[PDB]
Design a protein around this ligand. Structure first.
Ligand SMILES: [Mg+2]
Lengths: 39, 303, 94, 103, 300, 257, 197, 184
């Protein structure tokens, strides 16, 4: 998985996700699916 | 006679999926009639006594051996035919006669399993077979292989290790006369009792009396006994007793639960020469597991 | 895995052993002496037990000092070597 | 009458759970096992041939201690049986280890 | 053509083997295919190999490694023993019983592949199962598998974010399970079964199933007797753990306390005489060894 | 590969079975089938083994000693005995079907009758046949073979094999069914046989014996079941010896020249 | 084996399998038929055919082939000079005169006739690697030769090579049997022709 | 069926290799000449060999069964491998391999593995049947009055006893010789 790992020892994939908004976009999608509405 | 008649078998009525009218008439009716005629000619006082009682009381007898032979053969044939019910598919006369190529066919007893006793709802037999044979497929292939290997007349039995009621010194005790340890398969040939608590050590006793008679003749003639000969006889005796020495003692009875016939008279007439394996296959799918389930007594799993 | 390599030889005029070590057995009449000397050193000179060994020396010495000598063979390994060297050597063809 | 004691060199102790042949009870078998006696126990236990870098072990005197004779002389390639490069690196390691004075 | 005929030729049927002909180690199973010559054939040194075997060989069975070698010599050995040892096992006829209770592997059970548990050890074996030199096993294989995972990075991400977002948000300890499941499915596809080398079971020693009875002239046998030799009285560890030779197999035998004084009468020569043994059980191990058990029977 | 031999006048036998003995269907049951079955089973047993280069008589001799090689011995003995039976009941060995020389008739040889007189108690041949059937019924319950053999002593006996037991080898006669009770004298004879084989010093545990047969009658239910139904085995054997091919038989007797 | 290969036989080999070179059999068949009817032609012509083989156990095949083809065989070791030094080696053994039917004429031979040399018209060698001196005697004495050539032999020493295995009794017997039968057929044809033209 | 003497030109492969690098120029291997390969004897290989090795290192005791290598007549061999049991040959690993080849040739199954397991299970079934047949045949013979001189167990015991007796003599002689050596 790379960026989503919970290991304190991670790789460059985390940096790639951070710089290119990838991980932020993933978290936003997860929140939008789960956080609001909840109908 | 009525005592040797079955509700499943009727004159002129094929056993569906097993034999035609001719097959039953030749395999069962002709043979049972012949055995009854021979036994009656050989003994008038037979009808009142069951075959099992006759075998138990009369045995190990050279003078009256043929009484036991014929009675046991009749009992064996009846017991084998008792469990047969009739398989829906593949009528006996419908399928074609098998030729030489039937030999090269690879058996599928390793692959296809049919007529499971679970289907009839008998779980006690399910557990007994799984425990004493690991799996149904192993049990089925063992039966088919064993009976098939019999060259001439013989039977294969699903006997049960009925632990002796205190080495046969007791009997009719609650739950013990119907207490067995495990299941086993035995191949009897030419009218051999599946239960071998009787007829066990017969060769041993014959050897014992022979050695004694030889000793008496030697001493009467004055010939001194030879130590090595006695040692050899002791070794033969020791192996014979150690071989047939159950933990309970007095040998272990093997009650019969199910039998499969091997005599060519049963199948040669209709299934042809090459069809023996086919006959066995059709038989396996024609067992009424309710009867054997009822015959199966209680287990020993208590201690 | 990496066992020591096999080293061949340049073509040789012949393959033979100078003085082959052929199997041989002692007379045991000298061994009898060795045991008797051991008995003398431990039990005592011409001690009772040594007497049995003494008689054994007498028996082995009576006819020959070293007893009867036989089973004197020779090793024919040179014969076989010379016989099948031309095949076993693995020399390149002509 | 005969003495009940026999040297191990004349008694083949067959291992458990192994096939055997009648020949294995003959003197031929013991002579064969004696001549063909291999040292594969080393082969499985020499970490040096496992692939590890010998020069790394210069700080562990014991590991090299099994490749030196009683007085410390380095065993020849035949006895050690390592690869040429592994042996040369092992020799450098032990010589270095002597320099630091652990040997 | 000729290539296909050579593929089916009896020489080709024999698997190539380069194991030592004279092995001085523990022997747990045959390591060479026995070749047999018909009497007439042997009469003309026609074993079927490349070159005729020298006349001095009178045995009709031999084991070979190389059809021809640099020294113009056929690497062979006229032993044919193993077949006799197998036949002796079939003499005793004691069936093989699975040690771990594993059900017979001679039956493709429909449910056997179904019932299963997580096997991370398989994941370990996928890269550290090579058990070879460090520069290749620990570097080349690890690089290869890491490259393989690179191709399965986005797919894992989308699946986890789509189907299991709660656990990812919570960082549950169960997250590892999805990783194992994913890798399993990726190496459980078509062509992914690969090949597994391991002794299936009896391995051809005995295709006998338990349960059948050895009906005998004197009656059904309850305990089997076979002549044998007690190998040594030194046993093992002085833990009442002897050894004995029975019909080609070295099998342990159980002794009652105070064993027979026969060994005391003569010791370490006990192999001279023969005894009678019961075969308690025969269960094999992962190495192919058969841990046959026996018991010593003596007249009272 | 073992192949069923070609019999003379095969067309005549295929059209109708041996006259006075078996019907076409019955003969096709014994020969032309269950004989190809026997050959195929034997070939599958010995294919790729040194035994496949030998003939049934030789393989059964070689196999007698080996305990767990009994399948091959059993197969070979059946094949050999069966062909013996077919030959000795063949209507005419000579291929004179086209010539239609039905005048050919077979009668016992004077030497053969003389041998009967020497053997037993000098009884007549018909009495021998009757008592032979008698024993066939009484001491062969299942299948087996009926033999009139000749020993080294020049005295014909009757061997009541209860299975595929070749007369050639008395250790493998299988003449006493041990499954049923056994008399004291028979068990004594068995123990004597135990001793006799034990005396042999050969590494293969074999014993000399000649006892080659003269008359073969198949007692397997593959022969009479169809033609003679069940229990009529006595009538089957009776008619078999009635029309026995005598030319081959009296030839089987050692002419002494 | 490959470690023994002689490169001069590269064209005769089909490849290597299990550590040994595999001879092409189409070529072996073509050469064998050529050699076979060379033998038949010589036998029909009425020449002398010599069958040479010195490996152990070959004598039976040589003797049988010689008697079928009315030729000669040498299962013992070839004697150097048998062809170049014939008068010294074989000058002491006596000969005979035979007619077109291979029937002796029972006529005495003058000393000069006996002292002459009889030269085989065809030489067949089963182990040309060991009988090299026999091949060199033939090449020097102008006698065509047939030999079984393995992946170790030199095909240029023999007029008519037969690529095949030479270390197996079955192979040499099979090849030599085909050659002998061809020679026998030639002899029968000659006998028929001279009996009836 | 591999082709000797063919060189894959750079133009033939336009796509990137396993490492994502486009091949644009011939490499050192392409420079070299390959006449030796043309004249080298080809190295013959068959897929069946891998299976044969796998089988015999999965069924070690299958080696115990002797195999005759003297071919009878390979040309006159008509085999329908739908059923591996075939007159003229025995039941052995080769039967498994041929059956697997036939299964794949007909394409009834997929990869090597499945066809191999199918054939293997068939081979188990036939072998179990044969072993049971031999055991029951033995039982038949003894039940019916069959005499046996020497069995495999007793044959082994007797030969072992011969070797042991020779060994006994040798060891006593060696012991007294060792007594001689140490008595010095
Ligand atoms: Mg050669």
């Amino acid at each position: 998985m790379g960026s989503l790992s919970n290991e304190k020892f991670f790789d460059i994939s985390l940096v790639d996700s951070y710089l290119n908004k990838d991980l932020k976009n993933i978290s936003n999608k997860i929140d939008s699916k789960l956080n609001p509405t909840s109908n | 006679s009525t005592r040797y008649a079955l509700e499943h078998l009727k004159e002129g009525a094929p056993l569906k999926g097993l034999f035609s009218i001719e097959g039953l008439q030749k395999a069962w009716f002709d043979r049972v009639k012949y055995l009854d005629a021979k036994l009656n000619d050989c003994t008038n006082e037979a009808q009142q006594k069951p075959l099992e009682t006759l075998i138990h009381e009369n045995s190990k007898s050279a003078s009256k051996k043929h009484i036991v032979n014929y009675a046991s053969s009749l009992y064996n044939l009846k017991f084998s035919m008792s469990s047969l019910q009739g398989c829906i598919r593949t009528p006996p006369e419908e399928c074609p006669r098998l030729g030489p190529e039937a030999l090269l066919q690879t058996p599928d007893f390793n692959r296809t399993i049919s007529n499971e006793p679970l289907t009839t709802g008998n779980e006690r037999l399910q557990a007994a077979l799984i425990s004493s044979f690991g799996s149904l497929m192993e049990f089925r292939t063992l039966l088919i292989n064993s009976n098939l290997a019999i060259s001439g007349d013989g039977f294969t039995w699903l006997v049960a290790r009925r632990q002796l009621d205190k080495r046969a010194m007791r009997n009719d005790m609650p739950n013990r006369d119907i207490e067995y340890d495990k299941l086993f398969i035995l191949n009897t040939y030419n009218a051999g009792t599946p239960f071998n608590f009787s007829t066990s050590g017969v060769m041993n006793e014959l050897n014992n009396q022979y050695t004694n008679m030889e000793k008496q003749r030697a001493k009467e003639a004055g010939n001194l006994e030879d130590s090595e000969m006695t040692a050899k006889q002791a070794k033969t005796k020791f192996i014979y007793e150690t071989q047939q020495k159950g933990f309970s003692g007095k040998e272990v009875s093997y009650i019969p639960l199910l039998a499969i016939d091997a005599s060519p008279k049963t199948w040669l007439t209709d299934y042809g020469v090459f069809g023996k394996r086919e006959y066995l296959e059709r038989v396996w799918d024609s067992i009424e597991w309710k009867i054997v389930e009822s015959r199966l007594p209680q287990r020993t799993k208590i201690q | 895995s990496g066992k020591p390599p096999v080293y061949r030889l340049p073509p040789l005029p012949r393959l033979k052993v100078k003085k082959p070590i052929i199997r041989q057995e002692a007379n045991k009449c000298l061994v009898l002496m060795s045991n008797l000397l051991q008995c003398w050193s431990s039990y005592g000179h011409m001690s009772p037990k040594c007497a049995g060994l003494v008689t054994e020396l007498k028996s082995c010495t009576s006819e020959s000092a070293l007893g009867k000598r036989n089973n004197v063979q020779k090793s024919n390994i040179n014969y076989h070597a010379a016989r099948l060297y031309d095949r076993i050597n693995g020399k390149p063809h002509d | 009458q005969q003495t009940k004691k026999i040297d191990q060199s004349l008694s083949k102790k067959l291992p458990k759970g192994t096939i055997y042949d009648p020949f294995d009870f003959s003197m031929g078998r013991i002579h064969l096992d004696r001549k063909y006696q291999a040292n594969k126990n080393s082969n499985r236990n020499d970490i040096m041939k496992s692939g590890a870098n010998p020069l790394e072990f210069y700080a562990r005197p014991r590991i090299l201690s099994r490749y030196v004779t009683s007085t410390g002389r380095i065993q020849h390639r035949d006895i050690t049986g390592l690869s040429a490069k592994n042996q040369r690196r092992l020799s450098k390691a032990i010589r270095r280890c002597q320099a630091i004075g652990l040997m | 053509t000729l290539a296909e005929l050579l593929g089916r030729s009896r020489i080709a049927q024999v698997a190539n083997n380069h194991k030592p002909l004279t092995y001085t180690g523990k022997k747990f199973h045959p390591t060479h295919q026995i070749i047999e010559t018909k009497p007439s054939t042997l009469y003309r040194q026609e074993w079927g190999l490349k070159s005729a075997i020298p006349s001095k060989i009178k045995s009709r069975y031999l084991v070979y490694n190389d059809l021809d070698t640099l020294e113009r010599i056929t690497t062979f050995e006229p032993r044919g023993g193993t077949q006799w040892n197998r036949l002796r096992f079939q003499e005793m006829g004691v069936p093989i019983v699975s040690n771990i209770g594993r059900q017979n592997p001679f039956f493709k059970y429909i449910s056997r592949p179904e019932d299963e548990s997580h096997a991370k050890l398989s994941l370990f074996k996928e890269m550290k199962g090579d058990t070879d030199i460090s520069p290749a096993a620990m570097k080349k294989r690890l690089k290869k598998i890491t490259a393989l995972i690179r191709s399965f990075q986005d797919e894992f991400k989308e699946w986890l974010v789509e189907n299991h977002p709660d656990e990812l948000k919570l960082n549950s300890n169960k997250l590892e399970d999805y990783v194992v499941k994913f890798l399993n499915k990726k190496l459980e596809t078509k062509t992914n079964k690969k090949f597994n080398t391991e002794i299936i079971g009896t391995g051809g020693l005995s295709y006998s199933l338990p349960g059948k009875l050895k009906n005998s002239p004197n009656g059904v046998i309850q305990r089997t007797v076979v002549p044998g030799r007690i190998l040594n009285v030194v046993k093992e560890n002085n833990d009442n753990k002897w050894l004995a030779a029975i019909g080609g197999f070295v099998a342990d035998v159980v002794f009652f306390q105070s064993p027979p004084s026969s060994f005391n009468s003569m010791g370490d020569f006990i192999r001279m005489k023969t005894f009678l043994f019961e075969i308690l059980e025969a269960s094999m191990e992962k190495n192919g060894s058969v841990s046959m058990h026996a018991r010593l029977l003596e007249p009272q | 590969i073992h192949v069923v031999p070609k019999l003379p006048n095969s067309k005549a036998l295929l059209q109708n079975g041996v006259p006075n003995i078996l019907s076409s269907s019955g003969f096709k049951t014994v020969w032309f089938d269950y004989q190809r079955y026997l050959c195929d089973k034997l070939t599958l047993a010995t294919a790729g083994q040194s035994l496949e280069s030998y003939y049934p008589f030789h393989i059964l001799l070689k196999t007698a000693g080996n305990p767990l090689q009994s399948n091959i011995f059993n197969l070979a003995s059946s094949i050999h005995n069966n062909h013996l039976f077919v030959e000795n009941i063949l209507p005419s060995a000579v291929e004179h079907g086209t010539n239609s020389n039905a005048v050919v008739k077979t009668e016992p040889s004077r030497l053969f009758l003389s041998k009967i007189k020497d053997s037993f108690n000098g009884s007549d041949w018909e009495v021998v046949k009757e008592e032979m059937i008698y024993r066939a019924e009484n001491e062969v319950l299942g299948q087996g073979w009926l033999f009139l053999v000749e020993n080294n002593e020049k005295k014909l006996f009757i061997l009541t094999s209860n299975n595929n037991g070749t007369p050639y080898y008395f250790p493998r006669n299988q003449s006493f069914d041990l499954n049923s009770a056994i008399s004291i004298d028979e068990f004594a004879t068995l123990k004597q046989m135990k001793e006799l084989i034990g005396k042999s010093t050969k590494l293969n545990g074999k014993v000399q014996d000649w006892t080659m047969p003269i008359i073969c009658v198949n007692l397997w239910d593959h022969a009479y079941l169809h033609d003679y139904g069940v229990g009529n085995r006595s009538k089957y054997v009776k008619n078999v010896l009635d029309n026995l091919n005598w030319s081959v038989v009296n030839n089987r007797i050692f002419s002494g020249i | 084996s490959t470690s023994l290969w002689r490169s001069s036989t590269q064209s005769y080999i089909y490849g290597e399998y299990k550590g040994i070179h595999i001879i092409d059999l189409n070529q072996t068949l073509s050469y064998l038929k050529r050699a076979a009817k060379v033998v038949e032609g010589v036998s029909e012509s009425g020449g002398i055919i010599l069958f040479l083989g010195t490996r152990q156990g070959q004598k039976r095949g040589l003797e049988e082939a010689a008697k079928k083809t009315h030729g000669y065989y040498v299962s013992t070791r070839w004697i150097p000079g048998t062809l170049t030094n014939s008068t010294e080696i074989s000058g002491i053994w006596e000969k005979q005169e035979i007619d077109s039917n291979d029937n002796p004429t029972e006529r005495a031979l003058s000393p000069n006739e006996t002292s002459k040399q009889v030269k085989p018209d065809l030489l067949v060698v089963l182990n040309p690697t060991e009988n090299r001196n026999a091949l060199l005697e033939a090449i020097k004495s102008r006698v065509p030769t047939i030999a079984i050539i393995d992946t170790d032999s030199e095909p240029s020493l023999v007029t008519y090579p037969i690529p095949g295995n030479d270390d197996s009794l079955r192979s040499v017997n099979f090849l030599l049997g085909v050659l002998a039968r061809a020679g026998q057929r030639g002899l029968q044809n000659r006998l028929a022709r001279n009996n009836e033209k | 069926g591999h082709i000797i003497g063919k060189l894959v030109d750079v133009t033939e492969q336009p796509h990137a290799n396993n490492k994502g690098l486009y091949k644009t120029r011939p490499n050192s291997s392409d420079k070299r000449v390959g006449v030796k390969r043309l004249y080298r004897p080809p190295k013959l290989t068959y897929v069946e060999d891998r299976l044969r090795s796998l089988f015999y290192k999965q069924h070690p005791w299958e080696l115990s069964r002797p195999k005759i290598l003297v071919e009878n007549e390979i040309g006159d061999e008509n085999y329908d491998w739908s059923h591996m049991l075939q007159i003229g040959r025995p039941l052995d690993g080769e039967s498994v391999i041929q059956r697997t080849m036939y299964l794949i040739k007909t394409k009834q199954y997929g990869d090597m593995v499945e066809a191999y397991d199918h054939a293997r299970y068939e081979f188990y079934a036939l072998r179990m049947q044969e072993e049971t047949e031999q055991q029951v045949a033995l039982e038949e013979a003894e039940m019916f009055g069959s005499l046996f001189g020497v069995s495999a167990i007793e044959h082994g015991i007797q030969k072992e006893q011969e070797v042991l007796d020779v060994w006994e003599k040798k060891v006593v002689e060696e012991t007294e010789l060792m007594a001689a050596r140490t008595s010095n």
